[PDB]
Design a protein around this ligand. Structure first.
Ligand SMILES: */C=C/C1=C(C)C(=O)N/C1=C\C1=NC(=C\c2[nH]c(/C=C3\NC(=O)C(C=C)=C3C)c(C)c2CCC(=O)O)/C(CCC(=O)O)=C1C
Length: 174
């Protein structure tokens, strides 16, 4: 077996897209929520949704023909917000959160009423965000839900780190 292929097998990251897809579904089922999504930052701290599980009837953000970019002004200004410092955000009702109109408009376009978002770190860098969304109504999230999502964020982060590691072994022999 080829070195890079044995590694891939040891680090458990054959096919990171399938990992994201199946895991977001499993989380969505556990949390009984309406969407679970993985969002990847661009160097300018804009970014896009790369994977999701989404319930019956809600707008889809990921797919063959779809591409959902969210350039968030606040996250761009701050280079990843509080998520840089490994903090999580828990919002039971977006209308009680004290947001600005233009941010609320984006949340409404995604049919979000309540959500959790946690960091996804790759190496020591903030790579993206993992979020769970309630679309049907407000929701009072509980600590086990947000601590678990945080724990999955760590899992996704390491998986991405393995993928970047393997990628960045670009053209060394052995
Ligand atoms: C009003 C200009 C803005 C445009 C256009 C825009 O897209 N965002 C704009 C402003 C603000 N965003 C603010 C906070 C904020 N943004 C996000 C981003 C996401 N949430 C997610 O679920 C995903 C994808 C998984 C992204 C990319 C987050 C997490 C937050 C933090 C919310 C919080 O801490 O509760 C923001 C500050 C809050 C506000 O005053 O509205 C502004 C102004």
């Amino acid at each position: 077996m080829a070195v890079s292929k044995v590694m891939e097998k040891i680090l458990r990251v054959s096919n990171i897209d399938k990992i994201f897809q199946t895991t977001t579904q499993e989380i969505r089922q556990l949390l009984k929520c309406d969407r679970v999504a993985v969002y990847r930052f661009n160097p300018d701290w804009s970014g896009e949704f790369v994977a999701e599980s989404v319930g019956s009837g809600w707008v889809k953000l990921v797919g063959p023909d779809i591409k959902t970019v969210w350039e968030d002004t606040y996250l761009q200004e701050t280079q990843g917000g509080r998520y840089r410092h490994q903090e999580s955000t828990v919002v039971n009702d977006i209308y009680e959160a004290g947001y600005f109109s233009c941010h609320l408009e984006i949340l409404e376009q995604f049919e979000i009423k309540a959500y959790i978002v946690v960091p996804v770190f790759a190496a020591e860098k903030l790579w993206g965000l993992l979020a769970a969304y309630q679309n049907s109504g407000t929701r009072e999230w509980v600590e086990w839900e947000s601590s678990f999502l945080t724990q999955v964020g760590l899992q996704f982060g390491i998986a991405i780190s393995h993928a970047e590691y393997l990628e960045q072994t670009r053209l060394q022999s052995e």
